[PDB]
Amino acid sequence: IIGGTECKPHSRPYMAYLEIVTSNGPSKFCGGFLIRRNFVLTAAHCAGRSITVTLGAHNITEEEDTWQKLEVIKQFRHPKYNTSTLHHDIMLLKLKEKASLTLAVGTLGRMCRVAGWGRTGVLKPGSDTLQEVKLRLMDPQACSHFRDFDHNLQLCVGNPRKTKSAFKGDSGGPLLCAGAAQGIVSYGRSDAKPPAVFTRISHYQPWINQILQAN
Numbered sequence: 001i002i003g004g005t006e007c008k009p010h011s012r013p014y015m016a017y018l019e020i021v022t023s024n025g026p027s028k029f030c031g032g033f034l035i036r037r038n039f040v041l042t043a044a045h046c047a048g049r050s051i052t053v054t055l056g057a058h059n060i061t062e063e064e065d066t067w068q069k070l071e072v073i074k075q076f077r078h079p080k081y082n083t084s085t086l087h088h089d090i091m092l093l094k095l096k097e098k099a100s101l102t103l104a105v106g107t108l109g110r111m112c113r114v115a116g117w118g119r120t121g122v123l124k125p126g127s128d129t130l131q132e133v134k135l136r137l138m139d140p141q142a143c144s145h146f147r148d149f150d151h152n153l154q155l156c157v158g159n160p161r162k163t164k165s166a167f168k169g170d171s172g173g174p175l176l177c178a179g180a181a182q183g184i185v186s187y188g189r190s191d192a193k194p195p196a197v198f199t200r201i202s203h204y205q206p207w208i209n210q211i212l213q214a215n
């Protein structure tokens with residue numbers, strides 16, 4: 001998160017930290033959010049060979065009792081996910097067990113909020129601590145330069161006049177507007193000039209519900 005503030009610890013109890021393992025490279029990192037005790041929503045580009053989820057985290061380097069490190073048994077990438085366009089950048093992860101409900105872990109032009117452990121700047125490393133920022137929801141013409149952006153599929157997020165933005169490592173995390181999850185962090189520019197592209201959750205709700213009811 002660029003230009004945000006450190007969260008009050010455990011104030012966003014649905015937030016999930018994803019370590020993503022591939023066969024030909026070192027660990028990758030994503031965000032995500034708990035919508036059932038055994039399901040986490042995130043972005044499809046965060047898929048890999050295997051994934052471990054950490055709930056209850058704030059400072060991701062300092063292990064504490066709030067932590068629940070949970071195995072992912074199955075990844076459900078949208079069947080129409082496109083790795084070039086990032087169309088339909090949404091994925092469900094089924095946890096091996098139901099997480100415990102605690103204080104620190106629970107299920108989940110207007111201003112919206114997004115949080116994550118991602119980079120704090122173009123050359124800055126990933127944040128140790130959960131960070132959050134307020135961003136403006138923009139009319140779709142603001143994201144026109146992203147040639148494969150589509151207003152029905154995706155939100156345009158982040159005033160281009162400001163620095164504030166989600167950035168690398170913040171992928172998969174929720175965009176909350178007035179307390180409700182509206183988007184998922186998908187992609188933006190390398191230089192981190194906003195706006196950024198987020199998955200529009202509303203369009204995918206029937207698909208989300210199909211996956212939950214079969215699993």
Ligand SMILES: COc1ccc(-n2nc(C(=O)O)c(=O)n(Cc3cccc(C(F)(F)F)c3)c2=O)cc1OC
Pocket residue numbers: 084085086146148165166167168169170171185186187188189190192196197
């Ligand atoms: C479909 O089209 C695209 C797909 C991917 C990327 N793209 N490219 C990057 C690069 O290194 O070139 C890069 O770093 N990021 C990460 C990134 C940059 C800014 C904001 C975010 C966040 F969290 F979404 F908000 C992520 C990225 O998504 C860019 C595209 O279109 C130019």
Ligand SMILES: *[C@@H]1O[C@H](CO)[C@@H](O)[C@H](O)[C@H]1NC(C)=O
Pocket residue numbers: 059060061062128129
């Ligand atoms: C997070 O914890 C690590 C290890 O104690 C420390 O290096 C880092 O400074 C901490 N960051 C905070 C509390 O912002």
Ligand SMILES: *[C@@H]1O[C@H](CO)[C@@H](O)[C@H](O)[C@H]1NC(C)=O
Pocket residue numbers: 080081082083084085
């Ligand atoms: C992904 O998108 C490109 C560009 O529109 C399309 O031509 C390509 O065949 C797609 N790939 C899949 C497997 O969806």
Ligand SMILES: [Zn+2]
Pocket residue numbers: 009010058064066
């Ligand atoms: Zn704590």
